[model samples]
Target: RFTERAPKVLALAQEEALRLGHNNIGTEHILLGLVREGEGIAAKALQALGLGSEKIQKEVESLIGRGQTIHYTPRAKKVIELSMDEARKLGHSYVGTEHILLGLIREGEGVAARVLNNLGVSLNKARQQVLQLLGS
Candidate 1:
């Protein structure tokens, strides 16, 4: 099950796609959503690691210059599915923003993943940061 905030993240993801003039929701949009949400562990961790939401948005736009209601890309849907797996793997009962962010990293081939990597966010390092923030 998704946590209370998880659905909001998806909603924001679609909003980001719309904001970027994208007709489809991609991992990049999800990444934007996670950072823009700004209150979840995912956002907090990224912020602590020096990735600002605006920076991520700018990076995404620079990579995929944009110009639809919105459809979820296959990889974007996969990230959501993987987020559930990540939550379960961590013994969490509900999928949350951090798990989605981890899913973005795990997918590893999307624009979101590339942006994160380009911005110096390794999967291992991101996980470490998230865990640290959770105090686990």
Candidate 2:
């Protein structure tokens, strides 16, 4: 159920991982990709929260130095899988950036979640924003 932007976000996440010199695509990379994508509901939500990919990139670098090679962490994969479920839960026929974001929030233990929490983001707040932006 991945929407057009969803796949692009996944692909861009690889680029983000590489740019960060990371060998693996982690939830942080995925979160970065969402902002880099720059044209999705997730991006809008994050921007509304005063988050930027550049800032997130710095947070990621501060937390986990750098690396090389290429691959996806199991947690990253899980977030994508959970994103699908999030779309389903929301009765959306397609998985979108918002669902991916919710996936990251739900994952709860990955770098993405840590960074978001550190930035004063909360799941309830994020969900409320998503629903508000969605006019739900």
Candidate 3:
């Protein structure tokens, strides 16, 4: 569903990592960019849960803030892989932010999960919300 949007997502994630002085783009940065993408079940569902890109940006800033730019952490790559798996499990043909969120939740590591947890968004909660938002 989002093959064309994938590059934009990565670009935005890179931009965020640079802005945050992050040495590498991680799942947390991906989460930030997902909201920045501004459209998708993930963003919509998260928005419904009282989170916007601005709030997520603030959370990421507060949580990890800035660092020198670098590359993707292995854990972040793992998250991506899991996201793909999640999409496949859902019978989805393309990757999207919702899958990314699933990866973060399922991965249960690093700043992304922590940020979501801080917002009272658990794995199951995020999943259900995504499904609801998708009208499935």
Q: What total of clashing residue pairs does each candidate reach?
A: 0, 1, 4
Estimate the overall C-alpha local distance difference test score of candidate 2: 0.88
Error of 2 at 100 (Å): 0.5
Compose the digit string of candidate 2's lDDT tens values, residues 1-136.
6888888888889998887788889999999999889999899889999999888888888888876568889999899899989889889989999999888888888899888888888877787777778775
lDDT of 1 by residue, 38-125 (tens): 8888888788889998899889988899795689999999998999888888899899998998888778889898898888878777
lDDT of 3 by residue, 13-114 (tens): 888898878788888888887778877666666787888888788888888866544788898889889889988998898987788777777888788888
How do the candidates rank by TM-score, highest first?
A: 1, 2, 3
User: What's model 3's lDDT at 64?
Assistant: 81
Better of 2 and 3 by lDDT: 2
Tell me the spans in candidate 1 whose CA falls farther than 4 Å from its real position: none
lDDT of each model, Cα atoms only? 0.86, 0.88, 0.78
Q: Once superposed on the true structure, which residue ranges of model 3 sit more than 4 Å away at CA?
A: none
True-structure lDDT of candidate 1: 0.86
What is the number of residue pairs that collide in model 1? 0
All candidates' TM-scores?
A: 0.93, 0.92, 0.87
Which pairs of residues collide in model 2? Answer: 21-67
